[PDB]
Symmetry: C3
């Protein structure tokens, strides 16, 4: 409700007919209408006048007031507009306003009021609607490739893959004299999801076996967006993407308290991830936690209602904690845990097999680097 009541008044000192959308203003309706509409709603021949902390909108018709009352307001135009539509509907029922004829068509008017303003929100009405109801440097030549990717994952406790998707691009920065043709060879990709974009100056080659892409690179750095998958794409992490982390969550009911063990697994031991954090949520009746972890720091945070474990760099590792809970209610379902991580590989598995350049002698592929970042990575 914003609109307390929609009311037709006689300034005889009583609300002649009126509508209470939901039980609130019963008897209240009559006293307001009876005092205030007598004074012209205390108006001066102004449509808005407010008295005793209630907004009264009105129009005089004879010894009668057609009145809209609100004590809250959403918009200027609106309050008038419901009153106005009401004023098209009221002479159809009662041939202007007049207490005896208003009285006789209590049902008509009242029904219109419910229809016009429903639970205090100003709906619209019309006389036809109403009817249904009442019916040169090449020494320098070098090339660098940077594959930046983000992976997203939703997984069950069971380890169900659910949905995943990798987003990425491979940027190339090349210092090469002349205009050299380059051929790029990459692994073959599949994607449950979809998206691939190719930079201009990218040509597609058809070969009986293997796929190839060739292009003259712009100098400096540019998104390759080569052909093949492209060097600008959304691939599905689902399609052959590796999820650097798998979290195995074992919640346990210690009884009054709860013991949670969180298992983190990384890919090959040799590779190390960085900026890893595991966010393990906790229930509202927290008490306090005791957490233990071999590597990194772990801290419980109230407010957040989550325990956050941070590890600068990890070959791979795990954490455990015991929680104390007051037990209101019954058991609560767990919310998913999320992780942030950085890995020096792409888990879209993009591999740059070979980029051979022509128009000249061998350039040096000084470096190829891979930056892998976590997107929305969630596991229950």
């Amino acid at each position: 409700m914003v609109l307390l009541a929609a009311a037709v008044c006689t300034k005889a000192g009583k609300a002649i007919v009126s509508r209470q959308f939901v039980e609130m203003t019963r008897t209240r309706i009559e006293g307001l209408l009876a005092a205030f509409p007598k004074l012209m709603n205390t108006g001066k021949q102004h449509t808005f006048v407010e008295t005793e902390s209630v907004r009264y909108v009105y129009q005089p018709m004879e010894k009668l007031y057609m009145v809209l009352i609100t004590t809250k307001n959403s918009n200027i135009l609106e309050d008038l507009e419901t009153l106005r539509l009401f004023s098209r509907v009221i002479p159809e029922y009662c041939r202007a306003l007049e207490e005896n004829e208003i009285s006789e068509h209590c049902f008509d008017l009242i029904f219109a009021f419910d229809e016009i303003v429903a639970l205090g929100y100003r709906e619209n009405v019309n006389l036809a609607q109403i009817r249904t109801f009442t019916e040169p440097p090449i020494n320098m030549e070098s090339v660098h490739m940077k594959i930046e990717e983000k992976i997203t994952l939703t997984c069950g406790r069971d380890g169900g893959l659910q949905n995943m998707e990798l987003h990425g691009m491979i940027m190339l920065r090349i210092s090469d004299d002349k205009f050299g043709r380059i051929r790029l060879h990459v692994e073959n990709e599949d994607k449950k999801g979809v998206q691939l974009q190719t930079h201009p100056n990218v040509d597609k080659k058809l070969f009986t076996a293997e796929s190839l892409i060739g292009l003259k690179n712009p100098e400096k750095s540019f998104p390759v967006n080569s052909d093949v998958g492209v060097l600008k794409w959304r691939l599905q992490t689902t399609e052959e993407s590796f999820i650097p982390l798998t979290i195995n969550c074992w919640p346990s009911e210690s009884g009054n308290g709860c013991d949670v063990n969180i298992e983190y697994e990384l890919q090959e031991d040799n590779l190390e991830l960085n900026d890893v954090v595991i966010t393990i949520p906790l229930p509202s009746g927290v008490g306090a936690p005791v957490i233990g972890e071999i590597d990194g720091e772990y801290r419980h945070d109230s407010r957040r209602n989550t325990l956050e474990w941070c590890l600068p760099v990890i070959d791979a590792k795990n954490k455990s904690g015991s929680l104390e809970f007051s037990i209101p209610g019954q058991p609560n379902d767990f919310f998913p845990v999320q992780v942030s991580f950085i890995s020096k590989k792409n888990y879209c598995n993009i591999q740059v097999t070979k980029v051979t350049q022509v128009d000249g002698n061998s350039p040096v592929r000084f470096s190829t680097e891979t930056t892998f970042l976590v997107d929305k990575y969630e596991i229950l």
Copy 2:
């Protein structure tokens, strides 16, 4: 001796068929990764029927 709390860790199982029973005094723990079960054992021999 004493009453010691024990935590059991086992591999994760699946079953086309169905049936699992847990002894009382078996608690279930929820962990982000891995599953764990904890319980104070009755002394002597008993069916664990852990979680």
Copy 3:
């Protein structure tokens, strides 16, 4: 058994000695085609091969 006279499906567990990976490329005006041939174990050698 299967028989010593049969049509078996190469599909059913037959090995295809060669897999060809064709990568056509649009050089632009021209076309560059790379054809990749793969054989089974390196030790074994095929003969009379033509692509």
